[PDB]
Amino acid sequence: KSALSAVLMNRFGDAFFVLGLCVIAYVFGTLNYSTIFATAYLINTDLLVLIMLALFIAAMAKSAQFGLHNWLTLAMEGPTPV
Amino acid sequence: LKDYYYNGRRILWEIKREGAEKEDWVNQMYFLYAPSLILLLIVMVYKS
Amino acid sequence: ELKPSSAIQRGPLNKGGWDAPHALHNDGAIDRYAHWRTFYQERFKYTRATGKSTLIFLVAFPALIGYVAYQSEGLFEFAGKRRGESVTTR
Amino acid sequence: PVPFSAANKKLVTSMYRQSLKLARNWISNRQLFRQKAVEIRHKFDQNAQISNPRLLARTLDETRAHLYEFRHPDPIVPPSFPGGTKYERNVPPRMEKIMQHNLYEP
Amino acid sequence: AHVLTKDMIQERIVALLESFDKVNDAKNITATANLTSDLGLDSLDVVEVVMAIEEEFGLEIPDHDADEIKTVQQAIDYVSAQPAA
Amino acid sequence: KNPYKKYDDQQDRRNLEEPLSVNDDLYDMWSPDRFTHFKNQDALKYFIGF
Ligand SMILES: CCCCCCCCCCCCCCCCCC(=O)OC[C@H](COP(=O)(O)OCCN)OC(=O)CCCCCCCCCCCCCCCCC
């Protein structure tokens, strides 16, 4: 049940990263870091807020901030070196 | 003869236990289904 | 005086094969439970809870997602964008 | 609800096992704990001479409610036991021969 | 590792009851001694020694199994029943 | 259910022929965790309070 909780929190974040990744490939037309960062300063700010909001909800899910933070301490059922 | 083979194989040549055996399907699935599927892979890769 | 004919000699019908021994102890409670769950629709009746869920999932939710879908047809392009450029067509 | 008897004995012994175990996980120190446990014992020693059923049941469910207020979030469990963390790590599989279902292949 | 025996449980419970104050004597203690009658313990002192015995063996007892161990031999057999030490 | 009573399946905490409830899988062992130390309305208040 603890592995279930961990994966479904991470999958909540995975869904918001799929949203953000669809907007990445829509706005810039590519996924490469080099092309997106070369044209990032030109793009509209509202799009930029929407993208980084979705990617931050992904990062907030895996890097365990308050919105879903339980699964770290519900991952002590796995052993010590894990 | 088919019933006398397989019923005796389930309850108990009968009184052996070896590994080498060919189920009825493995003749025309490893030697026709599998190479035609590898042939489908090879023609998709070079047709690309 | 009308009986089907004497030259029939009809015999019993088997399904044939090997008596596979029971790999499962069936539970009476689990079988009655699952038979009640799969055939739920023949004992379903409308109540206030049914009316609430039937209102909200068959009528209210399609109307809400409908209004949202028809308002937002040609609003948004984000395809190539700039600062100070509106993205809504309207 | 009843004077000196085996069922009242079972109830009061169960409540005393509780109050000791319940006090056990609040307190980290040994010294403060064993002081407190001697006090708890003195509370049970001051009672247990009550004759009527009325005041007996009154103090009984009053100390049951007093026992309910001091409940702890995680009781100290030994790990190999059903509250614990070692519970059901490798439960050994029961020795079973293979049941077969097909006349023809395994 | 560390595996107990029967005599280990014996000399743990005997030394345990030798530590306890409200016993009658430190000399009348046997394997077959009743905690209630032979040791002179109350209805509630047998519970305190069941608490100390369950803390001492590191094991947890439900209420249905705690009252049943009236004599010391029943306690030794019961504590030897479990795999945990 | 208490864990120390002997069941048929210790992991399910369920005897062999025991009638299964109206909406069983919310009352399963595989169900939610279902905390018992706070009343849920109270815990709602404490969470929103912090
Ligand atoms: C900038 C904005 C910041 C926003 C921050 C606020 C975010 C709050 C939203 C949190 C949402 C968390 C993700 C919800 C899905 C997580 C599913 C899950 O983790 O299920 C866990 C559950 C087992 O957990 P449990 O049994 O309780 O404990 C086990 C430990 N022994 O596993 C199971 O029991 C499996 C069966 C239940 C699975 C869930 C079924 C219902 C799913 C509902 C999803 C709702 C999604 C939309 C949420 C809207 C929130 C507003």
**Nearest CB partner across the interface for C83, out of A26, A27, A45:** A45
- List the one residue out of B45, E63, C45 whose CA is nearest residue D20: E63
Q: What stretch of H or E contains C33?
A: helix C28-38
The Cα-based distances of E43 to A36, D6, D11, F20 in angstroms read 79, 10, 11, 41
- Listing DSSP states for B1-48 in one string gives -HHHHHHHHHH---S---S----TTTHHHHTTHHHHHHHHHHHHHHH-
Contacts of B16 (CB under 8 A, 6+ apart): none
Name the residue with the closest Cα to ligand 1, atom 17.
A8
- List the one residue out of D45, D44, D49, D54 whose CA is nearest residue D18: D44
Tokens representing residue D23 in the block: 């006090």
Between CA E40 and CA E66, with CA D19 as vertex, the angle to 5 degrees is 50
Distance B14 CA to ligand 1 centre (A): 57
Contacts of D22 in chain E (CB under 8 A): none
Name the residue with the closest Cα to ligand 1, atom 38.
A8
Nearest chain F residue to C29, by CA:
F19
Chains B and E contact (Cβ–Cβ under 8 Å for 3 or more pairs): no
Name the residue with the closest Cα to ligand 1, atom 19.
A5
- Determine whether E65 is exposed, middle or buried from the number of CB atoms within 10 Å of its CB (0-12, 13-18, 19+): middle
In angstroms, what separates the C-alpha of F47 from chain E's closest C-alpha? 34
Q: Count the domains in chain C.
A: 1
In angstroms, what separates the C-alpha of D104 from chain C's closest C-alpha? 10
Q: What are phi and psi of F9, to 5 degrees?
A: -95, 115
Contact D60, E64 (CB under 8 A): no
The Cα-based distances of C4 to C9, C13, D85 in angstroms read 11, 19, 75
Q: Annotated catalytic, E42?
A: yes
Q: What are phi and psi of C76, to 5 degrees?
A: -100, 120
| F24/C29 CB distance under 8 A | no
Task: Please count the residues of chain F.
Answer: 50
* Ligand 1 atom with minimal separation from the A56 CA: 1
| D13/E66 CB distance under 8 A | yes
Measure the CA–CA gap between A39 and A32, rounded to whole angstroms.
Answer: 11
Distance A65 CA to ligand 1 centre (A): 14
- List the one residue out of A22, A13, A10, A12 whose CA is nearest residue A58: A13
Question: % helix / strand / coil in chain C, to the nearest 5?
Answer: 40, 0, 55
Measure the CA–CA gap between C61 and C55, rounded to whole angstroms.
Answer: 9
**Residue written as token pair 């469910």:** D61
Distance A9 CA to ligand 1 centre (A): 7
DSSP F8: S
DSSP A1: -
Q: What are phi and psi of A71, to 5 degrees?
A: -65, -15
Contacts of D9 (CB under 8 A, 6+ apart): E43
Ligand 1 contact via A10 beta carbon (within 6 Å): no
E6 touches chain F (CB under 8 A): no
Q: Which amino acid is at D50?
A: I
Between CA F23 and CA F32, with CA F29 as vertex, the angle to 5 degrees is 75
Contacting F with CB below 8 Å, chain C residues are 27-30, 32-33
Tokens representing residue A11 in the block: 């999958």
Task: Please count the residues of chain D.
Answer: 106
- Listing DSSP states for E12-56 in one string gives HHHHHHHH-SSSS-SSS--SS-BTTTTTT--TTHHHHHHHHHHHH
How large is the C-alpha radius of gyration of chain F?
15
- Determine whether F13 is exposed, middle or buried from the number of CB atoms within 10 Å of its CB (0-12, 13-18, 19+): middle
Q: Count the domains in chain E.
A: 1
Question: Could you tell me the sign of the dihedral formed by the alpha carbons of E45, E49, E54, E55, in that order?
Answer: positive
Distance A53 CA to ligand 1 centre (A): 20
- List the one residue out of D81, A1, D79 whose CA is nearest residue F33: A1
Contact E44, E4 (CB under 8 A): no
Scanning chain A, the segments in alpha helix (DSSP H) are 2-27, 33-38, 45-62
Contact E48, E22 (CB under 8 A): no
Contact C87, A44 (CB under 8 A): yes
* Residue D88 falls in which region: left (phi positive, over 0), alpha (psi -120 to 50) or beta: left
Q: How many CB pairs under 8 A join B and D?
A: 6
In angstroms, what separates the C-alpha of A39 from chain C's closest C-alpha? 10
Positions of chain breaks in chain E, given as the residue before each break (C to N > 2.5 Å): none
Contact F19, C29 (CB under 8 A): yes
- List the one residue out of E33, E8, E7 whose CA is nearest residue E20: E33
C21 touches chain D (CB under 8 A): yes
Strand partners, F9: F14
Residue C86 Cα to chain centre, angstroms: 44
Strand partners, E71: E34
Residue in C24, C25, C26, C27 to test binding to F, most F beta-carbons within 10 Å? C27
Contacts of C32 (CB under 8 A, 6+ apart): F19
F30 touches chain E (CB under 8 A): no
Tokens representing residue C49 in the block: 């809870």
Candidate list E7, E21, E25, E42, residue with the active-site label: E42
The Cα-based distances of E79 to C28, D77, E8, E59, E60 in angstroms read 38, 17, 11, 9, 10
Contacts of E65 in chain F (CB under 8 A): 4
Measure the CA–CA gap between F20 and F28, rounded to whole angstroms.
Answer: 10
Q: What is the 3-state secondary structure (H, E, C) of E52-74?
A: HHHHHCCCCCCHHHHCCCCEHHH
The Cα-based distances of E61 to C78, D2, E67, E75 in angstroms read 67, 27, 10, 11
Q: What stretch of H or E contains D66?
A: helix D54-69
Measure the CA–CA gap between E47 and E42, rounded to whole angstroms.
Answer: 9
Distance A5 CA to ligand 1 centre (A): 8
A42 touches chain C (CB under 8 A): yes
Name the residue with the closest Cα to ligand 1, atom 18.
A5
How determined? cryo-EM
Range of the domain at C57: 1-90
Task: Please count the residues of chain E.
Answer: 85
What's the CA dihedral at C38, C39, C41, C46 to 10 degrees?
-100
| D82/F11 CB distance under 8 A | no
Touching subunits for chain C (3+ Cβ pairs under 8 A)? A, D, F
DSSP A39: S
Ligand 1 contact via A74 beta carbon (within 6 Å): yes
Neighbours of C3 (CB within 10 A): 5
